[PDB]
């Protein structure tokens, strides 16, 4: 009956070649844990650790091995063909590089929005002629507003975003933004 | 004389606990009563007849304790009180969750590895670290399998295990690693 939990390691956003592990946890004991893609005929079968913990090892993933995965569990007792409520879809992204963000000045301090289209990324902002990152924050939301002080603000700037932990996936650097005097 | 019946097991003679096993006794001549023999206790068990020369026994979701040496006899009522056929050959049934790990060694410019367990008729499977797919796998009848490595591409770290040829698979613990220099 009630739906299980499906999570991924070491991250839900990975570069290609990374070994991914899907872990499904049932809120009650089960015999089988099916992995459900959209586009597949029959589900694929997790490997049981316990009656409430199963694992699916994704060996050295590829881009097409990304998409929307769901987990359902079942007992033989329920009868043929019937599964639990499907787990929330775990969205797995496999890319070598992430879509580049935009860097823009927003509507005397000055704020700069580096914006991508992906959540839970770390956003970094660079000034030209300055090696180390100027600023960076983690953002749940797919954008980061960097505030600059008016009197040290003019200069050239770029940004990129990236996942928070290794194995890193990095966005292509954004186009350059110039702040004039 | 009363020649021995034939005695087989399905789906295998080696299975993991929980597997539904079927035993077949076939008699060279027609009978009524087919009796199953387990050294413990004295009294034998009955098969279910399907005809005069075929009877079956169904061992429900087997446990490791239901494993061991079985023989089968047949009889006919006219043979008189307590007379059975010559017993079949021993059917050795093994019910285990995991098989004992094998040893893995390099035999005493090509290099040969031996993966050796104690159990007869297993597939053996050679693995090298860093490489996902099995190097070689071969079936064997002796309790071991020899694999040949091209001297050129031979150094590295290797492991091995063995398993049953058909489902329901019961796998051995994998061997300790073997480092070639």
């Amino acid at each position: 009956h009630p739906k299980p939990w499906l999570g991924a390691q070491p991250a839900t956003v990975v570069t290609p070649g990374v070994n991914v592990t899907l872990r499904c946890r049932a809120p009650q004991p089960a015999w089988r844990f099916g992995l459900f893609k959209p586009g597949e005929i029959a589900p694929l079968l997790f490997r049981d650790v316990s009656s409430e913990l199963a694992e699916f090892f994704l060996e050295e993933v590829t881009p097409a091995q990304g998409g929307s995965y769901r987990c359902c569990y079942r007992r033989p007792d329920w009868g043929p063909g019937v599964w639990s409520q499907p787990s929330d879809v775990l969205e797995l992204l496999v890319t070598e590089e992430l879509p580049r963000p935009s860097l823009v000045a927003l509507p005397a301090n000055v704020s700069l929005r580096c914006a991508g289209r992906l959540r839970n990324m770390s956003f970094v902002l660079y000034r030209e002629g300055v090696a180390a990152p100027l600023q960076y924050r983690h953002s749940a939301q797919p954008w980061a507003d960097f505030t600059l002080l008016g009197a040290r603000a003019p200069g050239t700037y770029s940004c990129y975003y990236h996942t928070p932990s290794a194995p890193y996936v990095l966005s292509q650097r954004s186009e350059v933004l110039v702040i004039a005097a | 004389y009363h020649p021995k019946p034939w005695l087989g097991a399905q789906p295998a003679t080696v299975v993991t606990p929980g597997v539904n096993v079927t035993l077949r006794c076939r008699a060279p001549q027609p009978a009524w009563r087919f009796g199953l023999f387990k050294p413990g206790e004295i009294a034998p068990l009955l098969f279910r007849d399907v005809s005069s020369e075929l009877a079956e026994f169904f061992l429900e979701e087997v446990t490791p304790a239901q494993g061991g040496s079985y023989r089968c006899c047949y009889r006919r009522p006219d043979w008189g009180p307590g007379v059975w056929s010559q017993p079949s050959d021993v059917l050795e049934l093994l019910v285990t969750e995991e098989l004992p790990r094998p040893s893995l060694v390099a035999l005493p410019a090509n290099v040969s590895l031996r993966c050796a367990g104690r159990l007869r008729n297993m597939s053996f499977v050679l693995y090298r670290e860093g490489v996902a797919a099995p190097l070689q796998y071969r079936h064997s009848a002796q309790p071991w399998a020899d694999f040949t490595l091209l001297g050129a591409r031979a150094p590295g770290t290797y492991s091995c295990y063995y398993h049953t040829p058909s489902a329901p698979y019961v796998l051995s613990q994998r061997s300790e690693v073997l480092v070639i220099a």
Partner: peptide, 20 residues
């Protein structure tokens, strides 16, 4: 004609933790 080979079996569980 005989059928095609079946798929590979799944990947095994993870290795033992390394030395110190």
């Amino acid at each position: 004609p005989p059928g095609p080979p079946g798929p590979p079996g799944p990947a095994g569980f993870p290795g033992p933790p390394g030395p110190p």
